[PDB]
Amino acid sequence: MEKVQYLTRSAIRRASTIEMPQQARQKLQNLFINFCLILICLLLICIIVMLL
Amino acid sequence: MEKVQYLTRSAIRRASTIEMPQQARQKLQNLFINFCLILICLLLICIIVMLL
Amino acid sequence: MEKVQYLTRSAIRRASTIEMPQQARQKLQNLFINFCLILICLLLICIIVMLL
């Protein structure tokens, strides 16, 4: 291999400045964006309910 | 195979905390986003019609 | 290839509840989204011109 031990070692070396179970990093970026769309929606609705 | 029975079994094992015909999960994330764009549009128009 | 006649027949069977030249279905989803971005833009500008 040498090619993998080099790539995996390159990450653990540049990722020693983070603290997440990985899975949360990926799930959060995607789940977040979709969560944002729904958040901005319920938001605009609030503002409207106030103008009534 | 062993490689598939391992991947399919890994999902049914981590997906036992869900209840959807799969198809709705995929169709909803994509159909939803597009639905959001149209929803936010008809929304801004409403607010405008009120400022007139 | 029995494999194609099975896939093409599966669509014409589940698509008998639609009426579009196909091409409009694909062109509309993509052209629409891009059209939405430009629509929401000219929109925000309108609202602003009104607050002036």
Next chain:
Amino acid sequence: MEKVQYLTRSAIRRASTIEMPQQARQKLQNLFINFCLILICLLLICIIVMLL
């Protein structure tokens, strides 16, 4: 080839109704969207500065 002369000829045939150096078509769709996000941002800020 015959496969390429057929695909390239199919485009120049259906693209004879356009006038762009190609590069602008691709760069514009992507650069535009990103430009839109920044445009909508500076926009909301304007409206706010007016409500103050």
Next chain:
Amino acid sequence: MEKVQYLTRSAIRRASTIEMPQQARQKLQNLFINFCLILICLLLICIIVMLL
């Protein structure tokens, strides 16, 4: 190789009109968009707090 020296040389040739450590270019486009979603959110909230 001749194929790589040709692609890498084609970039450094068309990128001599930029000044960024590369990494910031990629990290900024993605980090920016996500930053925008959060920015627009805290924004709508501000406006609301003002209508109260």
